[PDB]
Amino acid sequence: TNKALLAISAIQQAVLEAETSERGFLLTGIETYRDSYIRARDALAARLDGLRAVLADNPEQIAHIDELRLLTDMRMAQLGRVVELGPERMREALDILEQARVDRLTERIETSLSVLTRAEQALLIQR
Ligand SMILES: [Cl-]
Numbered sequence: 001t002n003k004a005l006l007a008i009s010a011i012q013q014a015v016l017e018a019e020t021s022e023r024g025f026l027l028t029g030i031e032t033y034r035d036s037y038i039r040a041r042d043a044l045a046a047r048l049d050g051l052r053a054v055l056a057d058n059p060e061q062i063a064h065i066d067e068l069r070l071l072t073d074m075r076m077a078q079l080g081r082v083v084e085l086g087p088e089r090m091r092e093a094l095d096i097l098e099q100a101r102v103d104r105l106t107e108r109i110e111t112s113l114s115v116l117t118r119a120e121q122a123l124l125i126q127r
Pocket of ligand 1: 048050066069
C-alpha cells in the first residue's frame with residue numbers, strides 16, 4: 001500500500017510536469033521545455049502501467065485506475081495538440097489551450113487520484 005501511494009503521487013507529479021512544460025514551451029519556444037513535456041508524458045505512461053501492476057489483484061482499484069487513465073489520456077491529447085500548434089502558432093495554441101479548459105480534466109484527474117489514495121488508505125487500515 002505504501003508502495004502504491006508513492007506511485008499515485010508520482011502520477012500527479014508527471015501530469016503537472018507535462019502541463020507546466022507545455023506552457024513553458026509555448027511561452028519561450030525553447031525545445032528543452034518540449035523535451036520535458038515528452039519526458040513527463042512518457043513517465044506518466046510508464047507510471048500508469050506500473051501502478052496498474054501493483055493493483056492487479058484489486059478489481060475496485062483496477063477500475064479506478066482504468067478511470068484515471070481515461071482522464072489522463074484525454075488530458076494528454078489536449079496538451080499534445082497545444083504543443084503541436086506551438087509557439088510559432090501562438091494565437092491558435094492559446095485558443096485551443098483555453099477551449100480545453102471547459103472539460104476540467106485537471107480537476108477531474110485530481111479527484112480521480114484522491115479516490116485511489118483514499119481507497120489505499122482505507123484499504124491499509126482495514127488490512
Ligand atoms: Cl492502465
